[PDB]
Write a protein that binds this DNA or RNA. Structure first.
Length: 108
DNA sequence: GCGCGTACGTGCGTTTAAGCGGTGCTAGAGCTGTCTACGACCAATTGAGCGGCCTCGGCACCGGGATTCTGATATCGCGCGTGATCT
């Protein structure tokens, strides 16, 4: 499902975004395939370094926002995941509309 | 000044082709030599162009008249609203 250079979805806040995998980290043998060992200037977060994490560059966002990803924050870019990302988007939009309506009512 | 709506701007992704480096080919721009005929120069002269004067008629002036025409009001017609009568 998670192929090097492939497409996927990711967790960031309450809304999902499309991302492309640039590197994949194997913790058992401790290197990433883009087998290249950890660089001095490259650091993987400790919370996910022990697990197989993924370097992903997200679509619709500049190149200088990419970072490493564990299993939890990422998902396969399938029809179910696409629909659920859309659902999260509509939920956020409705929540914002409800908040602004509540503020307007309070002001009155 | 206010309100709407939409159409550029900003940004990210994908695609295109500009750009650079390299080599080949030959077309034409440049240069050189030679030669001829075209133009400047000169002299003579006569005729086309210019200054001037005269005659006249095209057009500027002035007066009277016809014609738009611009603006308002009003009349008449059409449409909308209110009242009265019929179903």
């Amino acid at each position: 499902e998670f192929a090097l250079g492939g497409r996927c979805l990711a967790f960031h806040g309450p809304l999902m975004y499309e991302a492309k995998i640039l590197k994949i980290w194997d913790p058992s043998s401790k290197m990433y395939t883009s087998p290249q060992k950890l660089g001095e200037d490259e650091s993987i977060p400790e919370e996910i370094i022990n697990g197989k994490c993924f370097f992903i560059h997200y679509q619709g966002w500049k190149s200088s926002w990419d970072e490493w990803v564990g299993y939890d924050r990422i998902r396969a870019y399938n029809e179910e995941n696409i629909a659920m990302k859309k659902r999260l988007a509509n939920e956020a939009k409705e929540a914002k509309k409800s908040l602004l309506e509540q503020q307007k009512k309070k002001k009155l």
